[PDB]
Amino acid sequence: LVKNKCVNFNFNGLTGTGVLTESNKKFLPFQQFGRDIADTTDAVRDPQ
Amino acid sequence: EVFNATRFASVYAWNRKRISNCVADYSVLYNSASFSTFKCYGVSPTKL
Amino acid sequence: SNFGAISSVLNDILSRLDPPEAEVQIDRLITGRLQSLQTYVTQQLIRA
């Protein structure tokens, strides 16, 4: 895993471009991933 | 256990399987010319 | 909105399919997206 450099990410099939960081927002234990506004994947939890 | 099954069900009594929590390697499947028909709908077999 | 396509995000469409059968789905995305952008630009122009 890399943090501060934008790379190609692919979490359980879902993929795209951008950069990652620790989320200030907190998930509930069941939640997989979130989406800001419409079609803006804004946060995922590492499956590993 | 499904493809090499000793016997197969009837067409009117088609049997429905449960597959989960396991790794699928379809590359072995289509690389063997043991299937007369191999047709896919909506997803490319080469990218499974 | 998928505009009748298999999905909406380009990444899923390009991953699931191969170009000789994907091009139709990306094309069906393009026509609708271009229609929407043209509508937005026309509205903005008259508003301006």
UniProtKB/Swiss-Prot annotation, chain B:
Effect upon mutating S32L: In strain: Omicron/BA.1
Reported impact of S32F: In strain: Omicron/BA.2, Omicron/BA.2.12.1, Omicron/BA.2.75, Omicron/BA.4, Omicron/BA.5, Omicron/BQ.1.1, Omicron/XBB.1.5, Omicron/EG.5.1
Superkingdom of source: Viruses
Effect of S36F: In strain: Omicron/BA.1, Omicron/BA.2, Omicron/BA.2.12.1, Omicron/BA.2.75, Omicron/BA.4, Omicron/BA.5, Omicron/BQ.1.1, Omicron/XBB.1.5, Omicron/EG.5.1
Outcome of substituting N4Q: Reduced viral infectivity
Impact upon substituting T37A: In strain: Omicron/BA.2, Omicron/BA.2.12.1, Omicron/BA.4, Omicron/BA.5, Omicron/BQ.1.1, Omicron/XBB.1.5, Omicron/EG.5.1
Glycosylation sites noted in the Swiss-Prot or TrEMBL record: N4
Documented effect of changing R7T: In strain: Omicron/BQ.1.1, Omicron/XBB.1.5, Omicron/EG.5.1
Subunit structure: Binds to host ACE2. RBD also interacts with the N-linked glycan on 'Asn-90' of ACE2. Cleavage of S generates a polybasic C-terminal sequence on S1 that binds to host Neuropilin-1 (NRP1) and Neuropilin-2 (NRP2) receptors. Interacts with host integrin alpha-5/beta-1 (ITGA5:ITGB1) and with ACE2 in complex with integrin alpha-5/beta-1 (ITGA5:ITGB1). May interact via cytoplasmic c-terminus with M protein. May interact (via N-terminus) with host bilirubin and biliverdin, thereby preventing antibody binding to the SARS-CoV-2 spike NTD via an allosteric mechanism.
Function: Attaches the virion to the cell membrane by interacting with host receptor, initiating the infection. The major receptor is host ACE2. When S2/S2' has been cleaved, binding to the receptor triggers direct fusion at the cell membrane. When S2/S2' has not been cleaved, binding to the receptor results in internalization of the virus by endocytosis using host TFRC and GRM2 and leading to fusion of the virion membrane with the host endosomal membrane. Alternatively, may use NRP1/NRP2 and integrin as entry receptors.
Name of the protein in its database record: Spike protein S1
Source organism: Severe acute respiratory syndrome coronavirus 2
Lineage of origin: Viruses, Riboviria, Orthornavirae, Pisuviricota, Pisoniviricetes
Covered residues, full protein: 340 to 387 of 1273
